[PDB]
Amino acid sequence: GSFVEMVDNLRGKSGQGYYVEMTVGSPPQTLNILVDTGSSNFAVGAAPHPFLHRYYQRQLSSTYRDLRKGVYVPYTKWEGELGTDLVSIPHGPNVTVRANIAAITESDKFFINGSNWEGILGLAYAEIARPDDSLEPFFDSLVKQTHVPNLFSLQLCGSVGGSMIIGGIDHSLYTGSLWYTPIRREWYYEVIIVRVEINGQDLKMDCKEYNYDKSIVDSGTTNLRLPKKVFEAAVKSIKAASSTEKFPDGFWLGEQLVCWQAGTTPWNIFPVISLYLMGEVTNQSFRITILPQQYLRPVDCYKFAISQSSTGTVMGAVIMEGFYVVFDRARKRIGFAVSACHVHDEFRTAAVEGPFVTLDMEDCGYN
Numbered sequence: 001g002s003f004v005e006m007v008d009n010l011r012g013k014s015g016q017g018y019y020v021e022m023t024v025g026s027p028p029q030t031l032n033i034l035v036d037t038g039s040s041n042f043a044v045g046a047a048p049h050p051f052l053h054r055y056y057q058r059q060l061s062s063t064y065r066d067l068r069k070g071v072y073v074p075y076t077k078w079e080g081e082l083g084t085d086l087v088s089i090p091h092g093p094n095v096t097v098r099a100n101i102a103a104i105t106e107s108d109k110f111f112i113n114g115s116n117w118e119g120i121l122g123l124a125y126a127e128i129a130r131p132d133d134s135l136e137p138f139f140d141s142l143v144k145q146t147h148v149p150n151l152f153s154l155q156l157c158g159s160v161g162g163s164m165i166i167g168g169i170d171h172s173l174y175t176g177s178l179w180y181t182p183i184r185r186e187w188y189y190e191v192i193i194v195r196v197e198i199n200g201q202d203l204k205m206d207c208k209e210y211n212y213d214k215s216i217v218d219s220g221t222t223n224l225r226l227p228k229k230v231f232e233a234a235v236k237s238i239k240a241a242s243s244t245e246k247f248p249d250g251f252w253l254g255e256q257l258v259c260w261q262a263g264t265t266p267w268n269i270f271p272v273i274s275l276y277l278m279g280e281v282t283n284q285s286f287r288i289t290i291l292p293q294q295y296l297r298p299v300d301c302y303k304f305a306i307s308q309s310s311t312g313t314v315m316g317a318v319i320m321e322g323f324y325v326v327f328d329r330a331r332k333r334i335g336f337a338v339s340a341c342h343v344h345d346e347f348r349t350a351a352v353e354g355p356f357v358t359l360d361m362e363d364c365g366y367n
């Protein structure tokens, strides 16, 4: 129904991810923790790093249990000591669980200078958790140890705000209807993109090109990340549709900034982007549509928030900030609906529409 306690529990800064307040240990130790669907580890600062406001102090927790094991996690790195302790979310469900915690003792280019978060909540599946799949992720522990339903939902909104509804759906956070795409495999939140359209025109590419290796839903990524060939054809079309005004080379690369007079931003010159996702029924698909407001991130000055990806399509904060996303882990599917907080002009709106007939959808995925 409605979970008013959990609404507006997320804070952040443009491009620095969304964090939620969490308690660790007994007595409670408040920490700000990143919300990440692209990783599976629950890890926190445990040593007095210069960038940290606070850190997890294991000596102050009576309910801390040492696992006597080390964990290494590199990025495009941190190193910590494994243990368990009582974890709870103050603006979440009235429950407490004994979850695995990686106390970060040493980190290189992990913590951000000036940021207000002290850790990371990996919400993805065990298979990509470090060191191996035997380390239970937070959410898996939560479901086993309480009567919280195996489901969470995210409403990310363009300092920055949002809502994470743990264990249910808040129906005021979206308009229209939820359309579900299946989770292909339980590691990352993997989905299949079956068609891409720019302002109505199909990109006329093989659907395997959209999902090369894997396509994922990731709150830990800021941009919409398209594969090499897919991204290049997309920019080509956006340039064509917005050839009315001048743009430097670095803009489309994501380097330079484009500005207008306060309220002179021409949204109409920019095309909409539509991603078609595999549906619940055989040969059935549905499309999700994003406005320029989603893929042009404010920094009125803006920045081009679509870039190249080392994998398939990565549906980052750009996509998610337009939609209310339901991570229905119980039924191995991900739901999409128009976000009630998504930024839109009066003329056009972001949409979730269906059903469409798309044949040979299974072929679009990587083998």
Ligand SMILES: COc1cc(Cl)cc(CN2CCC(NC(=O)COc3ccc(S(N)(=O)=O)cc3C)CC2)c1OC(C)C
Residues within 6 Å of the ligand: 015, 016, 017, 018, 034, 035, 036, 038, 039, 075, 076, 109, 110, 111, 120, 188, 216, 218, 219, 220, 221, 225, 308, 309, 310, 311, 314
């Ligand atoms: C403020 O910064 C962060 C905010 C948040 Cl909420 C989380 C993280 C850590 N996340 C760890 C998981 C990672 N997601 C994945 O691995 C998912 O898969 C891909 C994603 C993108 C590409 S690519 N390179 O093609 O775009 C390729 C792949 C395979 C995102 C980052 C943040 O990063 C800092 C702390 C280091």
